[model samples]
Target: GANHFHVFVGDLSPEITTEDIKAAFAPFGRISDARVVKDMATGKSKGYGFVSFFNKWDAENAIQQMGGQWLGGRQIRTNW
Candidate 1:
């Protein structure tokens, strides 16, 4: 399997943080890194985030299991 996978997560709430994302997917796999893009000036969440895993399988599993799940009252749209 590939060592890395890129994922797009949508429908994120403005209050969602990187730690929220990490905890959400922690049950699925080992997270190497979790980041949520934020506005530089306002210092607010961009309503999206990325999660990197030690293995592609973990990413894929997280995508499959967590995609479309509810977070902060919104469904997450995940893609790779």
Candidate 2:
């Protein structure tokens, strides 16, 4: 996990899925994994999630370019 990073995505639509996250960051680089946090009780999205990139540069690129950009009909917040 040397080059890995955890990106924080917020204001996500309830319907957003891990695939959506991967697609958003796929252009940057390889994704180690992506996940949308869910409410255990209802099995619904928590409106936020995390994405990990395989390379540090790719992760940085995503933060700079994708951060504050709209995805799933809302602007997402990306960070380490």
Candidate 3:
């Protein structure tokens, strides 16, 4: 019953943070939250992340525009 506000982002670089994710996705729409997954034990990023927008349309737009795009010297994957 919903397009959903959340999107999955894969192949992220550990060096980048939530601010970087917001920067990449902000052009698409208003972002609600941006977060990078990390390994608790090793204290390193999992090379994947998640982000949410205020609207479903914005999240979908991000999936379309950002999918397979290169960032931080690596190819990022995006999907709803």
RMSD in Å for all candidates: 2.4, 1.5, 2.4
- Which model is ahead, 1 or 2, in terms of TM-score? 2
The C-alpha lDDT values of all candidates are: 0.83, 0.84, 0.86
Q: Candidate 1, TM-score vs. the true structure?
A: 0.88
Clash pairs for candidate 2: none
Q: Name the 10 consecutive residues with the lowest summed lDDT in model 1.
A: 1-10
Q: Residue-wise lDDT of candidate 1 within 1-80, one digit each (tens)? A: 55666677888999899888888878877877788899899999878888887878778888888878999889999987
| Cα misplacement distance, residue 28 of candidate 2 (Å) | 0.3
Full ranking by lDDT: 3, 2, 1
Q: What TM-scores do the predictions have?
A: 0.88, 0.90, 0.88
Instruction: State the lDDT at 22 in candidate 2.
Output: 80
Which whole-number lDDT from 0 to 100 does residue 13 have in model 2? 85
Superposition TM-score, candidate 2 onto the true structure: 0.90
Span of 10 residues, lowest total lDDT, candidate 2: 1-10
lDDT of 2 at 69: 90
Q: Which stretches of candidate 3 lie over 4 Å from their true place?
A: 1-4
lDDT of 3 by residue, 1-80 (tens): 44448899999988978888889888988877788988899978888899988888778788988988988999999987
Model 2, 33-63: lDDT tens per residue? 8999999999999888898877787788988
| Runs in model 1 lying further than 4 Å from the true structure | 1-3
Q: CA lDDT of 53 in candidate 3?
A: 87
